[PDB]
Amino acid sequence: ASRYWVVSLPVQNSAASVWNRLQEQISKHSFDTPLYRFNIPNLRVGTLDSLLALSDDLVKSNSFVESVSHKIRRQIEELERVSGIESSSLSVDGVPVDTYLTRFVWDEAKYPTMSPLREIVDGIHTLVAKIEDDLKVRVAEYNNVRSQLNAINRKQSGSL
Amino acid sequence: HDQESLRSSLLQWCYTSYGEVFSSWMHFCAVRVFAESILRYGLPPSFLACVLAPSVKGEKKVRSILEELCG
Amino acid sequence: LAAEQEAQHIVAAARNAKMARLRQAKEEAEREIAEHRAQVER
Amino acid sequence: MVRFIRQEAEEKANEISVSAEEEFNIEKLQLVEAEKKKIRQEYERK
Amino acid sequence: GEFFSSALTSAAAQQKLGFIAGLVPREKSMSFERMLFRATRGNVFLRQAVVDEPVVDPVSGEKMEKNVFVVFYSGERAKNKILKICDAFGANRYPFNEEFDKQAQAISEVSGRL
């Protein structure tokens, strides 16, 4: 599949024509750039030490996201019958890739707690790990089924 | 036949779990927006970046625009 | 600097003054206990 | 920068103090419950 | 001790923080700014020398352009990476007292011992 491709810029460092022009009316329209975003801040933020700890844990979070992406792109596609879930069917946070990447509404109470995210990030990471574990269980079931496949019928067709 | 069904029905649940993982990745990107905001700005979460999969030319133009905060 | 003044005695003052709230809780507890004791004695 | 760190330190100190005060109030409620129990015991003895 | 009046003023102008006292060679200017962006975050202040004289290594008298510097750490979590950055600098690094007079006295005592 596709790895992470999000840009990095705070509110005070918008690259558009105006500070609020990042969402729309930016020069990216002239270049046909598909960039889109919508603010969704948390209830509160941690201290400087908490910020540094979150930055350190972001590496592990990205590694887990990459592992989940690799599992989803490999196990489903290799079966030649599981890749039928399109972007709308596999919509992120209930919105397709057109709208999922244009907003951060996934920060609601489902994976995080809509609260200081120092531990909410870890909780969401644990939830994603559980989802990936379920996907791995499904992949193991598919492997056992393939073991059931290529059964005694794989031998000769008789008189051999 | 059971293996084919699992690749079509159980693996349909696997594809649903893949969509859930995509939702989790969207949440991770939302968290990373605030992480970058804290890293390169004040503590409260506030970001004006964007997330997409653009071409090389578009990314180069975005980098040229944002060179005021280059890495 | 400003951060040093923020992490200065400004917060430790409230940390120590929490003992005042604890003392107020103890005082109200004693008052309630004394009132109940007076009522039951009466 | 430093002002944001100032707010976080004050907010953490304020929340900790409020939690400590609530815990002290709960401890006081338990203390008055114990005092009422022992007062009942001594009244029964009398 | 020089930073006790320079780095302190820089931090006051830019404003709990850690002490990043130590050293950073004349070639460590890029690593102090281009690198360690996650930890410093641009809100910290630092005072550094240009290695005006060849500073002897902590275990070698051959010396080099090992300028010494003192900075502010953005908490212990960021100080963990700041210590690694200072170790990567590999100059004549040694912590000193916060007070300018005490730091100068320590420098004089170390020079006399040397």
Q: How far apart are the C-alpha atoms of E58 and A81, rounded to whole Å?
A: 65
In angstroms, the first-to-last Cα distance of chain B is: 55
Q: How far apart are the C-alpha atoms of D26 and D12, rounded to whole Å?
A: 21
Runs of H (alpha helix) within A19-116: 48-78, 97-100
CA distance B71 to chain A (A): 10
Structure tokens that stand for A49 in this block: 């030490």
Chain E positions touching D5 (Cβ under 8 A) are 16
Spatial contact of A105 and B33, defined as CB atoms under 8 Å apart: no
Q: How far apart are the C-alpha atoms of A48 and A55, rounded to whole Å?
A: 10
CA B30 to chain centroid? 8
Chain D positions touching E12 (Cβ under 8 A) are none
**Dihedral angle, C-alpha B64, B68, B71, C1, nearest 10 °:** -170
Chains with 3 or more CB pairs under 8 A to chain C: D, E
Distances (CA, A) of A135 to A2, A95, E57, E80: 18, 21, 55, 36
Long-range CB pairs of E79-84, under 8 A, 24+ apart, other chains included:
E79/E18, E79/E20, E80/A52, E81/A52, E81/E36, E81/E38, E81/E39, E82/E18, E82/E20, E82/E36, E82/E39, E82/E40
Spatial contact of B35 and A109, defined as CB atoms under 8 Å apart: no
Q: Of C1, C6, C7, which is closest to E11 when you measure between CB atoms?
A: C1
CA distance E109 to chain C (A): 29
Structure tokens that stand for A151 in this block: 């059964």
Q: How far apart are the C-alpha atoms of A142 and B18, rounded to whole Å?
A: 15
Per DSSP, E110 falls in state H
3-state SS, residue A44: coil
Tell if the CB–CB gap between D24 and C28 is shorter than 8 Å. Answer: no
Spatial contact of A55 and E38, defined as CB atoms under 8 Å apart: yes
CA distance C22 to chain D (A): 6
Search chain D and give the residue with CA nearest C19: D21
Spatial contact of A134 and B17, defined as CB atoms under 8 Å apart: yes
**Dihedral angle, C-alpha A56, A60, A62, A63, nearest 10 °:** 150
Pairing between strand E22-23 and E68-73? Answer: antiparallel
Resolution for this PDB entry, in angstroms: 4.1
C41: contact with E, CB 8 A cutoff: no
Distances (CA, A) of B61 to A33, B66, E100: 9, 9, 49
